[PDB]
Design a protein around this ligand. Sequence first.
Ligand SMILES: OC[C@H]1CNC[C@@H](O)[C@H]1O
Length: 848
Amino acid sequence: AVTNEEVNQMIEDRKVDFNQNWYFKLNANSKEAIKPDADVSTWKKLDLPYDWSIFNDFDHESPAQNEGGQLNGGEAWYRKTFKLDEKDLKKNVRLTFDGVYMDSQVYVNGQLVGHYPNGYNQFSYDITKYLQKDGRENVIAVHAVNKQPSSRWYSGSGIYRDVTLQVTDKVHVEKNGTTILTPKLEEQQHGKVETHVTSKIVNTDDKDHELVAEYQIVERGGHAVTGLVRTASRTLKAHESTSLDAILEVERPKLWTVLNDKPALYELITRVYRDGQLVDAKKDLFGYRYYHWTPNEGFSLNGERIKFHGVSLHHDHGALGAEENYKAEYRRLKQMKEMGVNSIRTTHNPASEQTLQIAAELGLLVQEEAFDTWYGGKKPYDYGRFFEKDATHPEARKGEKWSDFDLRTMVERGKNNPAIFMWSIGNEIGEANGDAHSLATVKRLVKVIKDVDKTRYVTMGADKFRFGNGSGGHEKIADELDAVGFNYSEDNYKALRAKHPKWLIYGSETSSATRTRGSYYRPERELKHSNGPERNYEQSDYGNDRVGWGKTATASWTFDRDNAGYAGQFIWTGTDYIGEPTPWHNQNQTPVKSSYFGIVDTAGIPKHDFYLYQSQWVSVKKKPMVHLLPHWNWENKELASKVADSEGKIPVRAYSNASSVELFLNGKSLGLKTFNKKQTSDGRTYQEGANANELYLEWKVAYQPGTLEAIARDESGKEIARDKITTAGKPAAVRLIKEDHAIAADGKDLTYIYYEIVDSQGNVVPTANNLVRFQLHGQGQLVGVDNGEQASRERYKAQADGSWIRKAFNGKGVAIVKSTEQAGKFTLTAHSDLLKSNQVTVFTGKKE
Ligand SMILES: OC[C@H]1CNC[C@@H](O)[C@H]1O
């Protein structure tokens, strides 16, 4: 008899991590790459993922230009050899790539399996017929090409996401074969909820077989919530496929939501029987949630009205480059969640598996975006050139173009993930102008999605709405969407809303405020696209710089807050990313190589607007807070002259979700100030400062060195939070700050250790740029160093002599250390010239 234990083992064994033991060579000879018994002594042995570009030096002559981060691409081969276990000799074998950038070719045993242009969409190949008989070694060779320029942001190059192997019986649930629907959830939620499941089953055998599917639903990390539900036994013919169906009932399921930080998730277990023998078993993640959206009230989730407090995110992880990593993406998404973010937009490409899983786990709604261009292109070597070409993937359907195939497979991949609620079929598509070609195209793409999944809003992000009054032919394209995304179009919302009263409208992309951490300039002014030499390649952490087409955090948020019919926004961006260093865009001889748009810097350190947003989006009951800016080191006349008002006072500002804030300088009160409480036209309560354009409270403070302390209080006058800033003396030491006391010894988990330049009393020196040198000992591996400074041209990776160094920027930076597969510990030591050295130790071992 097959025990539940055996079924769970079968599920685990069905899919394996195939990232280990690859060989990499830039510009490798094609014939050596694909052939048996190649000499790999000149190749780099490594474990995936591996983005080769992040290891380059910045290049002012890079064909990527600074928009692409001035890190070159080129072409490379990755090669791996493997053998099937004796028991797996007759099994079906599928190889899945979560992302390869880009224009890839996969070879198995000297033969071309497929060519796949898309740099971000997951793709997979059934490689069974290509493998050797009798368990002799197989060779996989992957060619990746990044011919530049191909991108408006840093892409990275190569196999930058996971590769997995599925080994299954000849009769099996096909790739993305599971559909899970809860069509009557709202009505049924207080009793038995019908859960409609569908399995696409394939018989790859040359014999007919009798087929039965058996299902059970379980709480993820919890218990069973159904028994086994069985389909009627039927024949599945040789080389044929079929869809089996069942309905399971789950009583009073916990509903997945963004309103908590560990939302409920479930798994469907599928057991497949061939002639009465269990041959295939798998699980599929899903959740129970429903939502609704109306023109005038916007969005609701499980009956609760919310706004999308969203961010747009690019894929890179700073010093990790394009390398996707669960722990890195977890840190980032949890950080967005700590801010009050409840949703994300994967701008402008399919998401990794890690991103999608973590969003489901943390409770973040997701818009996953297929395209940055259609047939027009934006950069010569981007996806545009492939968009209407015939798809040559071995599993593409007749007549499918690449755009059809890529969009379909993205949707089929993610259709059960409860976090995804929107599919975007394009961002700022210039050619989508309402002409016959673009109109045909929008309807074709909408239909590709609706044939797979009707439960999610098909959308686009459109900046065309910001020009003039926002009207034009593009309106016909918007009419074909479930929901219309406005990029930077607040100014035309009122008119577009009166014109199109049935549209579901939201800000697909907003703000594009530009900021450098710890840099301050002219807080009394709003600065528009201010990029003169007097700026020193920095933007203001007061949040008063924004691009020509952009808005400040305050202006973009207050508009959203005031308008119920504008359902939310996805801020450009939640974090900085490599490339696009507007407002120095493609000024290639300047130092800049990474973005200013992020609320948080590339090193994972929040800029001040993080706390502005937190004060707006996180309830005083959940996390009472107060945050002061700027720093309190104003000895430097040049720095101070750019900040001080006419009376020479420093504008000190507090963001807080409390009722009042009282500022003290060296223990002396500078006066309690109280937020003005107000209501939106539809009765929503909010707080503001001295006027509608100020969400902070402000004091003009005559500079006296010492301590500024802010006391935040509830309406009854009880202290609920404080913040404080202290004038630092001269650098005296480097201090290391551990995020984790321990991590898993799985060779995948990692940790972020911050370094700070401190004075002799342990105050961070807010202007310090001292060079820090790092040593690592023990069971760890340094994998990155960063300080988030846009103008920096420092390496993120090891120097050419193997050493690891990085300057502080405005007192701070981070070092990233990955675990090995051995338990133990690692010690990070930091040194700096004439300063005291410091070390921390992080343990490695058991997960959880
Ligand atoms: O302000 C910069 C943004 C404009 N909208 C599209 C984004 O990818 C980015 O270029």
